[PDB]
């Protein structure tokens, strides 16, 4: 059990003990995705307003 890279200071200590050794999308892609959902919304709203007009 090896106790290694001990570091001290007035606030505390730190070290490492070893018991055993080893055996992104674009900005435009995002605002296009956001706009494709916005149009799917505005379409479903137009389908409702068309139905309400009938």
């Amino acid at each position: 059990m090896e106790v290694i890279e001990l570091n001290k200071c007035t606030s505390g200590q730190s070290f490492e003990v070893i018991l055993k050794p080893p055996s992104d999308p674009s900005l435009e892609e995002i605002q296009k995705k956001l706009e494709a959902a916005e149009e799917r919304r505005k379409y479903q709203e137009a389908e409702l307003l068309k139905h309400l007009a009938e």
Binding site: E5, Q13, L19, E38
Partner: protein, 440 residues
Amino acid sequence: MRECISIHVGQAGVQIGNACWELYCLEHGIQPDGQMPSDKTIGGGDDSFNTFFSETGAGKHVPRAVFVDLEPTVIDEVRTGTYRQLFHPEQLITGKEDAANNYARGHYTIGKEIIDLVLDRIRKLADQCTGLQGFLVFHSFGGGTGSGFTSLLMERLSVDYGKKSKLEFSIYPAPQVSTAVVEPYNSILTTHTTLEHSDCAFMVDNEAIYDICRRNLDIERPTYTNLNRLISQIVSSITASLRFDGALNVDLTEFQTNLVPYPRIHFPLATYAPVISAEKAYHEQLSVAEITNACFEPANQMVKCDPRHGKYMACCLLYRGDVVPKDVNAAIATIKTKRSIQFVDWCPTGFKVGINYQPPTVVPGGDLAKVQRAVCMLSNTTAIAEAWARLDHKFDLMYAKRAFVHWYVGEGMEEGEFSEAREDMAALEKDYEEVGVDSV
């Protein structure tokens, strides 16, 4: 010194953020108006606390924080509350209609109209940063803001600040507390969209926190403020090494180096001991050996699961209080003989240790007794994949009937994002099972 910006999204992220910053101020000796008498270099500095607070000419110490809720009532209580003075109005951001427990409404519908305002208020904080390391993101899985807006925020932060690290603190949904039947949907959805933009994420199961408050604090029905002050202790344990002198976890990148060898498997388990009630008349202080042992009882983990039936990839102990290296190694020695602690073959079986000699500070009138020593363990064990199994199973039951799906489609989301998200989670569960189990 390098600065860290904390971002709190939704109700859960804001009220937990309030818990943290209250605790941070008590710990650094900053008072509600932002004054820090002990800060002798007035109006500036580069001490380690400066990674979280910035300084004004009048001597005010100001959190490097933005709060974001799509409805005003929760952040209004910040604006009117006992820490009103400490935050600049520009850091508290509100909408007026929330996301109604709907991932799609927070991401797509209400997200689109507020994302640019948030990024620029985030940019006003990054501009008073000589060297930014990145972000701490607080949010709920189950909220519509907490889940949907956060994942939109996370996507763009990757673009606007691609070299910076991003850590999350995520509240995982629990029916004893939870606000909604669709929270499994929101959880899977936002984990799938955030998975590649998050370098390391600390999950808190509201069930585990709840039960710790009932059993160890003798609160029969815990409130959010009960839950959050406990969560706040654990978060402050995890962040203390960024705010305080030390050599372990000194910046955000060390959190991934030390805890996340495989980047998809970036969900360390947090375990914390001891939680003692302030109403406990007679209490026998617990030793280094006792509190290190308590790190391996499931009843003290932030997520109930069973690490004996998994493998470790990493492990830190963060001690606060009267702790010295010799007692840690003696405690570790005795524990490895009496407990099932198996690592993956390609990692060392070992512990990185950090000690800070100041014991946990407790909020006055809180529920936590002051203790002479405490420890928070951070173990990247595959047993946390149990929480994904739970979540995914609940998701499967509802989606097999398309229950509630129509609410999401109606916000412009396409049904297929459900199945994509659920397939990502199917991968993630098998990654965990590859690393952490060997053949039957």
